[PDB]
Amino acid sequence: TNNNQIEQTIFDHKGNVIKTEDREIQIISKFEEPLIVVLGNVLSDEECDELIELSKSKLAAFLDDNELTAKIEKRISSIMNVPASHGEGLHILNYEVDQQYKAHYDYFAEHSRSAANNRISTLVMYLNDVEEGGETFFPKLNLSVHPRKGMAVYFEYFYQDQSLNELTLHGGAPVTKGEKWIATQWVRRGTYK
Amino acid sequence: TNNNQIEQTIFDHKGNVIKTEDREIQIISKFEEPLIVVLGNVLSDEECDELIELSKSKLAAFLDDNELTAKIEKRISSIMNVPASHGEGLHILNYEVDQQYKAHYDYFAEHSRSAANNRISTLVMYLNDVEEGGETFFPKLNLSVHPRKGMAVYFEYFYQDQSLNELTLHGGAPVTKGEKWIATQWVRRGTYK
Ligand SMILES: O=C(O)CCC(=O)C(=O)O
Ligand SMILES: O=C(O)CCC(=O)C(=O)O
Ligand SMILES: [K+]
Ligand SMILES: [K+]
Ligand SMILES: [K+]
Ligand SMILES: [K+]
Ligand SMILES: [K+]
Ligand SMILES: [K+]
Ligand SMILES: [K+]
Numbered sequence: 001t002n003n004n005q006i007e008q009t010i011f012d013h014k015g016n017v018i019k020t021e022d023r024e025i026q027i028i029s030k031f032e033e034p035l036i037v038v039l040g041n042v043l044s045d046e047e048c049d050e051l052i053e054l055s056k057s058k059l060a061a062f063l064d065d066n067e068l069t070a071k072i073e074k075r076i077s078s079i080m081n082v083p084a085s086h087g088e089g090l091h092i093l094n095y096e097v098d099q100q101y102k103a104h105y106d107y108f109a110e111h112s113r114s115a116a117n118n119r120i121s122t123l124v125m126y127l128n129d130v131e132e133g134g135e136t137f138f139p140k141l142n143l144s145v146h147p148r149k150g151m152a153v154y155f156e157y158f159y160q161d162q163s164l165n166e167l168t169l170h171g172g173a174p175v176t177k178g179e180k181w182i183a184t185q186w187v188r189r190g191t192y193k
Numbered sequence: 194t195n196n197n198q199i200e201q202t203i204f205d206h207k208g209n210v211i212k213t214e215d216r217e218i219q220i221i222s223k224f225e226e227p228l229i230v231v232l233g234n235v236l237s238d239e240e241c242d243e244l245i246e247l248s249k250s251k252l253a254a255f256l257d258d259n260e261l262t263a264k265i266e267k268r269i270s271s272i273m274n275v276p277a278s279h280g281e282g283l284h285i286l287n288y289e290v291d292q293q294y295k296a297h298y299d300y301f302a303e304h305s306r307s308a309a310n311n312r313i314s315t316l317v318m319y320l321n322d323v324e325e326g327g328e329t330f331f332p333k334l335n336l337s338v339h340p341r342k343g344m345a346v347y348f349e350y351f352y353q354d355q356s357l358n359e360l361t362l363h364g365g366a367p368v369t370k371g372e373k374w375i376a377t378q379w380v381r382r383g384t385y386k
């Protein structure tokens with residue numbers, strides 16, 4: 001269970017690359033406080049296509065644990081700097097035209113029961129190219145990340161100053177053309193298994 | 194000569210792509226005010242290598258006008274939304290290890306003679322991958338863009354509120370490993386030819 005009692009960030013990667021065990025991840029841009037990092041080459045095109053197909057074959061939502069998800073969760077754990085036992089698992093979302101996710105927080109309300117082991121960081125991976133729309137936007141920061149296949153946006157909200165955590169308000173913009181496929185890894189403060 | 198007398202941005206591209214005449218440019222992220230846009234697939238790897246070689250063959254600095262520079266300046270003009278006659282031309286810079294560009298503004302001081310036709314926007318294109326360091330950082334915004342071959346960072350400073358223009362303070366971080374090659378297009382308020 002993480003402890004921020006003496007302002008630091010969980011993500012501690014320096015430089016322009018993250019050399020994971022099976023892939024070299026690109027660091028594209030950083031908004032430092034609260035920490036929002038745009039990452040390139042997080043997933044290959046083949047991995048993006050298969051997470052989409054796995055979500056479709058299960059629909060006929062969190063994915064079931066095979067060898068692809070475990071491989072990606074280990075690579076994600078190197079990126080987010082938290083062991084994979086904190087991750088809720090790969091959650092796959094699909095936005096058709098005219099669908100969106102309005103602005104919200106990822107950490108749970110303090111009075112909620114899920115806040116006992118609350119989330120601390122999020123990684124959103126873009127599994128396909130969106131013809132128009134579907135950007136990840138942060139209203140209080142006037143910042144948006146646009147979907148691009150293989151890329152991802154990282155942001156954390158484990159600050160002592162709650163003002164910094166409240167700036168991580170974000171949503172998914174309406175898809176106007178095409179469709180949007182994303183994979184999301186939420187990281188809990190403690191072991192989630 | 195541009196006129197902002199009735200707050201709008203010169204860059205007006207919507208969506209996730211910029212369909213220029215010879216290339217589809219990716220919109221990666223946007224910091225909206227002041228407008229800073231991270232762009233992908235701005236230059237091919239072959240174009241990046243040749244602008245570097247052209248700078249080296251001229252050293253033995255602004256490049257001379259051939260067909261490659263005119264082709265890129267036309268593509269850049271579609272991105273920056275200003276005719277190429279406003280551009281100063283492709284300026285190539287090389288940072289070795291232990292070299293940097295400290296924080297500064299791109300528009301000239303108001304009492305300077307170059308401020309008669311002052312700059313309004315800048316595009317910085319990364320011509321190679323930097324092993325470590327060399328990020329384009331904006332201190333007053335706590336934002337940095339890291340170098341990635343083929344990508345570019347766009348930002349403009351033609352706002353009526355001078356507070357917004359003064360937030361475009363930026364520099365090139367010290368290169369600690371490898372080297373950094375960039376192409377820069379500065380756009381003047383009026384025709385520069
Ligand atoms: O659609 C987006 O870009 C944001 C996705 C998101 O908010 C999430 O899955 O946690
Ligand atoms: O080195 C950088 O990333 C910034 C380049 C720059 O400031 C310029 O060429 O105008
Ligand atoms: K594909
Ligand atoms: K869900
Ligand atoms: K309650
Ligand atoms: K506060
Ligand atoms: K379509
Ligand atoms: K569909
Ligand atoms: K090359």
Ligand SMILES: [K+]
Nearest residue numbers: 254255284286
């Ligand atoms: K110069």
Ligand SMILES: [K+]
Nearest residue numbers: 303304305306
């Ligand atoms: K003067």
Ligand SMILES: [K+]
Nearest residue numbers: 354355356357
């Ligand atoms: K002001």
Ligand SMILES: [K+]
Nearest residue numbers: 324370371372
């Ligand atoms: K080296």
Ligand SMILES: [K+]
Nearest residue numbers: 287288289372
């Ligand atoms: K060199």
